[PDB]
Design a protein around this ligand. Structure first.
Ligand SMILES: CCC1=C(C)/C(=C/C2=NC(=C\c3[nH]c(/C=C4\NC(=O)[C@H](C)[C@H]4CC)c(C)c3CCC(=O)O)/C(CCC(=O)O)=C2C)NC1=O
Ligand SMILES: CCC1=C(C)/C(=C/C2=NC(=C\c3[nH]c(/C=C4\NC(=O)[C@H](C)[C@H]4CC)c(C)c3CCC(=O)O)/C(CCC(=O)O)=C2C)NC1=O
Ligand SMILES: CCC1=C(C)/C(=C/C2=NC(=C\c3[nH]c(/C=C4\NC(=O)[C@H](C)[C@H]4CC)c(C)c3CCC(=O)O)/C(CCC(=O)O)=C2C)NC1=O
Ligand SMILES: CCC1=C(C)/C(=C/C2=NC(=C\c3[nH]c(/C=C4\NC(=O)[C@H](C)[C@H]4CC)c(C)c3CCC(=O)O)/C(CCC(=O)O)=C2C)NC1=O
Ligand SMILES: CCC1=C(C)/C(=C/C2=NC(=C\c3[nH]c(/C=C4\NC(=O)[C@H](C)[C@H]4CC)c(C)c3CCC(=O)O)/C(CCC(=O)O)=C2C)NC1=O
Ligand SMILES: CCC1=C(C)/C(=C/C2=NC(=C\c3[nH]c(/C=C4\NC(=O)[C@H](C)[C@H]4CC)c(C)c3CCC(=O)O)/C(CCC(=O)O)=C2C)NC1=O
Ligand SMILES: CCC1=C(C)/C(=C/C2=NC(=C\c3[nH]c(/C=C4\NC(=O)[C@H](C)[C@H]4CC)c(C)c3CCC(=O)O)/C(CCC(=O)O)=C2C)NC1=O
Ligand SMILES: CCC1=C(C)/C(=C/C2=NC(=C\c3[nH]c(/C=C4\NC(=O)[C@H](C)[C@H]4CC)c(C)c3CCC(=O)O)/C(CCC(=O)O)=C2C)NC1=O
Ligand SMILES: CCC1=C(C)/C(=C/C2=NC(=C\c3[nH]c(/C=C4\NC(=O)[C@H](C)[C@H]4CC)c(C)c3CCC(=O)O)/C(CCC(=O)O)=C2C)NC1=O
Lengths: 161, 48, 49, 92, 160, 173, 160, 161, 160, 161, 161, 160
């Protein structure tokens, strides 16, 4: 659980040296985007339910995982999805603010693909839901902010694959 | 019921080739860079 | 010898996950045997975990 | 080690090709044969030349010669290019 | 034949034939002449049967007989009965050696690429054999035609 | 695999005892229906290429979505003829291994050669499990059309197809 | 059994079962009534088939029971007859399965490793099964003695 | 945890179809034996302690697992047995009523053989106790009811093996 | 069903089933003939029970179908009736299982999370099931209408 | 393994529709940069050994991973690096031509961070090597071509993180 | 796969220093016992089959794993044991010569307890077989040599536990 | 070492160690007293063996230190001698291990990839080790100089 400042301090500390010009050079780069990330995390908090409603209706709403036999049939199983998609849109918001994807594999990625295989959850449909959820997130926060929030979505999709 | 499980990795089955595609893949398959012919091979298709 | 991938040959349903694992560079670091345990737990009951 | 530990019928490893090759054997044949595949017409794999001439070791000539006839091959000529005959010690 | 399958199948394991396999040879050889008596019944009805096969393969499929189809013309239809003659001759081999290899080492293995390079529609040949099996029931009584029935539909399964 | 017989003999070996008469009564029930289990199998070989064809049209007549574009869910139904060619091929297997398993009188051949990794394989390719199981029992009704006047062949034909249905299910209850 | 390996044979070959395979599953299940009678004879004759089995075994191999033999004393001789009760049981399985597949993976695969690792003369236990065979075939007619003896000599072959 | 009706409904539901003639055909077969199973579960509830007392005395009472060094020597270890055998006779009663052995592997079989190997409990003597317990259970409930209750005992013995 | 949770009740309590539990499994299976008749009535009346079910639902809740309602247009109204076909199906399961256990873990557990997450008024779908109940109980006698209606109102209770 | 044209065809095919104006609009955008990518992949093929020699000498040449005890000490371990860095500079060249980073996670990213943790390879020094390798690659191919080749380097660094 | 000399060289090399007095002090201690280990490995090679025959007859020969239902019933399963016990007596001989148990976990211990749980092999009876095999090995090689060979047996028993 | 690869040799061959392998582990450990004396000579002569090692290296290869050479200036020349201190250290490991196994997987495997990728002339570093060899063998007797020099020339062989 490290942000961009924590990761910069760790690497500069792990060699026992002070924060030289290169370490502060990245820190200044993070502070420049500090204004963009909060407004990105602002609108995502507002439209959390709307984004997840848009992703599932655009990716896996009417596919036969939704029908009987599919992986999402029963109401408990459907309700687990939007609960499950809420974490991806939420933890990706944390990575967008912290500027470092360490929180994702610390709290989301580890034991995740090993868990879906246990339950039999289709990893293929899961990533496309996150990809569609990444597509709507670029709608709200804009282009570059979508590039930032989108940079952690595919990090989840990559490791979850 | 099956009492074990090997896992289901994300696999994308092939669908077709393209002229932009396969010779990016042939030079890939040998673990070598794009060669002048197959990289001039990538060129004159994007000029089409 | 080539690697008989997925889009080469009619594959079998029984070692689907394992063979896709074995055809990766990550194969030589699963120091625990992946296939002899998987082919044996197919017959025994559910394990404790 | 060698292929004659005591294995025969009714033994734990499956009954298979048992060669009379010593420890790290250094005898090898020069064989020649054709071996039509007899399986390409329901597999439709690419075709490879079936007439080969190669040096097989003494450690595994018998398995290979036992297998070349398994798939209908014909052995045109074999010789012992490297190694001695009636040699008690020295095949290693 | 059936003994050849047991000698082969026992030879790749480097062992003599087991207790069950020697049953499979012994029971096969005790039903010996009845295949021999049966094939002489069918050989006397080859001109019987292929005339009846050309009945229904062409009333079912006049596409092939018509001008433009593959079987249009005399000499094309001339060998047409010859292919029935070879198939019926092959089945007499299969009825005797009590298995499918004479129907498989000949006739079945690679039959589609043979016909596809000839222009004969491979679906039409499936109905031709199905027509041939339909024709063999009339000149054969109920006792022995289900003995020869499983040898026909193997050919249909082989051709698909 | 294990037939009804070898499965019965392993039942008495684990306990290390000879075959009693309750053990032999189970074997005799196979030997009685054993002659009936064959023309069920012999009918399948004569009706094999047909019975897949009636199953497909009866399937897509209720699931027209399987012949349509997938939606953005990259799902493997019978969209393209490459998809359709392989997808009919699976119906080959379900009819085949459910044909041996009719003769063995036991579903041991089914799970170890069909069920083991079946949800594994279909979850990778995103294949329909719902329609995949429904086509398995469209075959069951289609095969039972032939043997229908009596009802002791029906339980024999139902046992393999019913076993794939209950086992490919994500358990709702 | 004949049913399970006729399947796994045709299983590996990507095909269904031929008439040669399905006319023998058919021929085996009609044989099933006669098999249970044969196994029923050996089932409640184990008292004589084993005890007279070890009768001739000691009168032919007194070394194994003499002081220094592996089956010496009241203890080992009881286990000396225990193994014969095992192998007599597996022959009853092979008769009902119509094959030595039950005898194969029980009491035959890797049997030389066990008996060599127990210090038992493997040739001696082979002599024991042969003595049981003469007692077993003496309890049945000629048509049956060609079967019950038939499974013993397979066990004799694999046990040396 | 499915009974015969739950398993029939699941397979008929998992294909999204109604309960056709084949699904109801097995359900009628289960309702016919509904009268037999209750009386079978009736007498087993009455003679629960008597059946377990008969099985242990008939299978493993005087063997040297009972003596010192054997797996059943101390009174805590002996008392664990009849506690342990009570579950096999009890859960087998549940499978006999539900008509489906799903409850056994759900609540008994999973982690069972892996647990006895940890404790060092002899699986060989365990199955023979259940086999002897199956033999006395056929005494009480009759032949066909014993065939039903016996059908789940060896299911435990098979998976526990 | 009543059979599975009367078991898991006595399962947790380390005991067998009492007469109170076994005189009701007994009483339920003799009730099984009458249950299939009741479910058979609702099985092939889904055309009227659903279509007249959505009849009164729109007359009582025109907001949900009016422009701005969740089920507005040709599309959503079709799915608007699809859910009623679902819940009418689960009631047929509960009648045959003799309990709302099938209706519990399908269509009831976490149902408010789904419909809140779909934007659908959960009170509106509760009104739909009540309209189906009056159509269903109008198709059966008084002794049956105390059951078929009995499972609907449980679904009404859990759906709010 | 999809290029920009394969990804455009897939999304246009996955909805079953033809290539409308929006699908061809991106395809025209890819063909415009087709001339830039080949020359970018041209010079990178020429200076493959020179780029990797520049990156390691600029990022991790003299750090104490290079010294004894560090992760790169022995000659087998040092030789594995330039072998390892060759793939990153090579596969990034493939992504630059294909215009789609699907080949990276297909053939590089999956099981990569899970492999370095097994060997104990420092992910921190690895990304800085790729960052330094990205810096020299912008030297050769120019600014915008460096922006293209650089866009796949940090994709590797993001997922490898 | 390191012996005592390889482990001493590694630790002295991993700090980049020469072989000081402490590193050579242990190396001299290993060369002193070099004469003892070969004679220990000499007699163990001679009595390999006799030692395994003594261990199984002394630990698990007549227990009910040997009887039907036990874990060692069938002849294939019995033959796998003495094959399996041969590795423990063989690899322990390698550790006794190399003076370092690195070869055991490299080639024996890893995936071993995870494999026996898959097959359902009783780990309890396995360790007692190795303990009994350790007891007979102290008979042949003597006391101190038995202390050396015994030091790697319980290393197998510890990790296999 | 000789102990670890005499094991892994006999390890792969499924056998124990022969007298040829165990009379040399025996012969090596009695040699261990003399090996530590030899490595003890090179241990605290690294000041002269390295500095005089780079003495002849620059007199024989002035290009590498001249302006444009890889080891040019105060900086690279220090690292120019650092590598010689490395390889002199590995020879002390090989002498105590009785084999070039320590020198094999350190400083030899893939060494051409490193030095080619550093721009260093690999032939030049080979000349450096040869200059160290004459200084090292000049510090020991003839019986020892056949060993200490013996490990250098192996490093010379693998370094070109
Ligand atoms: C914070 C990191 C994190 C994640 C991601 C997580 C996932 C997680 N997802 C679960 C289930 C589930 N997840 C799904 C999801 C899906 N079905 C589909 O078809 C889609 C592809 C997908 C929605 C995108 C379903 C249906 C279940 C229920 C499975 C069942 O009842 O068997 C469960 C089981 C327990 C429960 O939901 O209460 C866990 C623990 N846990 C975590 O700690
Ligand atoms: C299935 C058909 C077939 C046969 C027959 C066959 C024979 C064959 N016999 C061999 C050797 C041998 N064969 C013998 C045989 C004999 N010495 C005598 O004095 C006797 C006259 C004779 C025994 C009857 C000997 C001693 C060797 C070993 C020769 C050597 O080590 O140089 C070898 C060399 C390899 C090996 O044994 O592993 C082969 C391949 N291979 C086949 O595929
Ligand atoms: C032993 C197995 C075997 C077979 C079957 C075989 C067939 C065979 N069929 C042929 C042609 C042909 N076969 C047909 C056949 C037919 N037209 C119809 O409508 C029918 C359905 C069908 C016959 C029953 C026709 C029309 C041609 C001539 C095509 C052409 O050359 O234009 C030819 C080219 C030469 C020839 O006629 O002999 C061969 C070799 N060869 C073999 O070795
Ligand atoms: C013996 C038991 C067994 C089965 C069943 C089996 C199935 C199997 N089905 C496959 C693909 C497939 N299967 C389908 C099937 C379907 N699509 C639909 O929409 C329908 C629901 C369904 C037809 C009923 C499709 C489309 C593919 C290709 C997926 C793709 O490439 O897009 C593949 C990958 C291609 C290959 O065969 O190598 C396997 C292995 N393997 C086995 O060993
Ligand atoms: C079903 C296949 C099968 C077999 C055959 C089998 C054999 C078997 N024989 C054994 C012992 C034994 N077997 C013998 C046998 C003999 N002594 C003689 O002189 C004769 C030649 C021979 C008998 C005819 C003796 C003496 C022992 C005890 C050895 C000892 O105590 O060291 C033991 C160890 C004790 C036990 O658990 O019974 C096993 C497991 N197990 C199996 O699962
Ligand atoms: C078996 C238990 C069960 C239920 C109940 C269920 C419901 C369910 N209702 C849905 C949609 C829907 N449901 C409605 C429903 C309504 N609109 C109204 O005005 C009315 C108040 C109400 C119906 C009476 C609408 C309009 C949609 C589409 C919403 C959208 O497109 O955004 C969807 C998404 C599309 C689909 O896959 O069908 C599901 C999964 N799934 C289940 O497994
Ligand atoms: C094509 C995608 C792909 C990658 C990337 C890949 C990596 C990979 N890197 C490896 C090792 C290695 N990788 C390194 C790398 C480094 N040490 C450092 O200090 C640096 C931070 C870093 C260089 C940038 C080292 C030193 C090893 C050897 C580890 C060992 O011997 O224990 C190994 C072990 C086997 C071998 O090298 O032969 C694999 C498989 N495999 C793949 O298929
Ligand atoms: C070199 C390190 C190493 C070990 C140790 C190893 C063990 C190993 N033991 C096995 C089986 C086995 N192991 C046993 C052992 C035992 N049964 C008992 O009751 C005893 C407690 C125990 C003897 C001490 C048995 C009976 C099997 C056969 C299991 C089966 O057929 O299911 C198998 C399965 C395959 C086979 O034997 O061919 C492996 C791979 N593999 C290795 O690479
Ligand atoms: C233990 C085995 C081993 C070796 C050998 C090794 C070599 C090694 N030599 C290096 C540099 C170097 N090595 C040289 C060497 C030379 N210049 C010349 O003219 C001569 C021909 C030659 C020395 C005799 C120079 C000049 C550099 C610095 C190159 C630069 O700064 O670009 C570096 C990079 C800096 C460092 O981390 O030290 C390594 C890792 N590492 C190892 O682990």
């Amino acid at each position: 659980m490290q942000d961009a400042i924590t990761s910069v301090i760790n690497a500069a500390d792990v060699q026992g040296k002070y924060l030289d010009a290169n370490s502060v050079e990245k820190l200044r780069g993070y502070f420049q985007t500090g204004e963009l990330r909060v407004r990105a995390a602002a609108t995502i908090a507002a439209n959390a339910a709307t984004i997840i409603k848009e992703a599932v209706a655009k990716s896996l709403l009417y596919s036969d995982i939704t029908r009987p036999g599919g992986n999402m049939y029963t109401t408990r199983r459907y309700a687990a999805c939007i609960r499950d998609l809420d974490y991806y849109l939420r933890y990706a918001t944390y990575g967008m603010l912290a500027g470092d994807p360490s929180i994702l594999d610390e709290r989301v990625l580890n034991g995740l693909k090993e868990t879906y295989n246990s339950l039999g959850v289709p990893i293929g449909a899961t990533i496309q839901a996150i990809q569609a959820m990444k597509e709507v997130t670029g709608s709200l926060v804009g282009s570059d902010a979508g590039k930032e929030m989108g940079l952690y979505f595919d990090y989840i999709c990559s490791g979850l694959s | 019921v099956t009492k074990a499980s090997g896992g289901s990795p994300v696999v994308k089955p092939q669908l077709y080739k393209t002229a932009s595609m396969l010779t990016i893949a042939q030079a890939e398959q040998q673990d070598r860079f794009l060669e002048l012919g197959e990289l001039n091979q990538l060129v004159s298709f994007l000029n089409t | 010898p080539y690697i008989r991938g997925f889009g080469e040959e009619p594959q079998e349903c029984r070692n689907w996950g394992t063979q896709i694992d074995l055809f990766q560079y990550s194969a030589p670091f699963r120091k625990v045997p992946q296939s002899i345990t998987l082919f044996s737990d197919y017959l025994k009951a559910l394990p404790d975990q | 080690a060698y292929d004659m530990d005591g294995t025969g019928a009714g033994s734990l490893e499956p009954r298979g090709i048992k060669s009379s090759a010593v420890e790290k054997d250094s005898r090898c044949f020069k064989v020649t044969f054709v071996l039509p595949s007899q399986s390409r017409l329901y597999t439709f794999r690419e075709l490879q030349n079936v007439y080969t001439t190669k040096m097989v070791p003494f450690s595994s000539w018998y398995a290979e010669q036992q297998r070349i006839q398994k798939m209908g091959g014909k052995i045109l000529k074999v010789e012992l290019v490297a190694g001695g005959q009636m040699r008690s010690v020295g095949n290693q | 034949s059936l003994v050849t399958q047991v000698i082969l199948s026992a030879d790749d394991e480097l062992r003599y034939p087991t207790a069950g396999e020697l049953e499979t040879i012994s029971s096969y050889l005790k039903t010996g002449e009845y295949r021999i008596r049966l094939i002489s019944i069918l050989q006397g009805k080859e001109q019987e049967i292929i005339r009846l096969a050309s009945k229904k393969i062409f009333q079912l499929h006049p596409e092939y007989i018509a001008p433009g189809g593959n079987a249009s013309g005399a000499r094309q239809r001339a060998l047409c009965l010859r292919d029935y003659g070879w198939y019926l001759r092959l089945i007499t081999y299969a009825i005797l050696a009590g298995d499918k290899e004479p129907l498989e080492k000949i006739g079945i293995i690679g039959v589609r690429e043979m016909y596809n390079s000839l222009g004969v529609p491979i679906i039409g040949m499936i109905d031709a054999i199905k027509c041939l099996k339909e024709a063999t029931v009339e000149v054969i009584s109920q006792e022995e035609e289900d003995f020869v029935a499983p040898y026909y539909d193997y050919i249909i399964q082989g051709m698909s | 695999m294990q037939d009804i017989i070898t499965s019965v003999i392993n039942q008495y070996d684990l306990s290390g005892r000879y075959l009693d008469i309750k053990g032999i009564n189970q074997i005799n029930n196979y030997f009685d229906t054993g002659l009936k289990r064959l023309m069920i199998a012999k009918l399948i070989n004569k009706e094999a290429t047909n019975l897949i064809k009636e199953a497909s049209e009866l399937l897509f007549i209720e699931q027209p979505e399987l012949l349509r574009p997938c939606g953005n869910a990259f799902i493997g139904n019978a969209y393209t003829t490459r998809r359709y060619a392989a997808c009919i091929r699976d119906i080959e297997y379900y009819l085949r291994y459910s044909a041996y398993s009719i003769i063995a009188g036991n579903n041991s051949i089914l799970d170890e050669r069909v069920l083991d990794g079946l949800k594994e394989t279909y979850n990778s390719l995103l294949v329909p499990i719902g329609p995949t199981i429904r086509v398995i029992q469209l075959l069951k009704e289609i095969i039972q059309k032939k043997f229908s006047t009596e009802n002791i062949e029906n339980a024999i034909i139902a046992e393999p197809f019913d076993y794939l249905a209950i086992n490919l299910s994500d358990k709702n209850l | 059994s004949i049913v399970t390996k006729s399947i796994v044979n045709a299983d590996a070959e990507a095909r269904y079962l031929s008439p040669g395979e399905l006319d023998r599953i058919k021929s085996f299940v009609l044989s099933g009534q006669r098999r249970l009678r044969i196994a029923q004879t050996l089932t409640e004759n184990r008292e004589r088939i084993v005890k007279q089995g070890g009768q001739q075994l000691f009168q032919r191999r007194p070394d194994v029971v003499s002081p220094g033999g592996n089956a010496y004393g009241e203890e080992m001789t009881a286990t000396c007859l225990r193994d014969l009760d095992y192998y007599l049981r597996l022959v009853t399985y092979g008769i009902i399965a119509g094959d030595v597949t039950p005898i194969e993976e029980i009491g035959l695969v890797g049997v030389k490793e066990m008996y060599s690792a127990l210090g038992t003369p493997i040739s001696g236990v082979a002599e024991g099964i042969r003595c049981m065979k003469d007692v077993a075939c003496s309890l049945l007619s000629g048509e049956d003695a060609a079967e019950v003896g038939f499974y013993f000599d397979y066990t004799l072959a694999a046990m040396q």
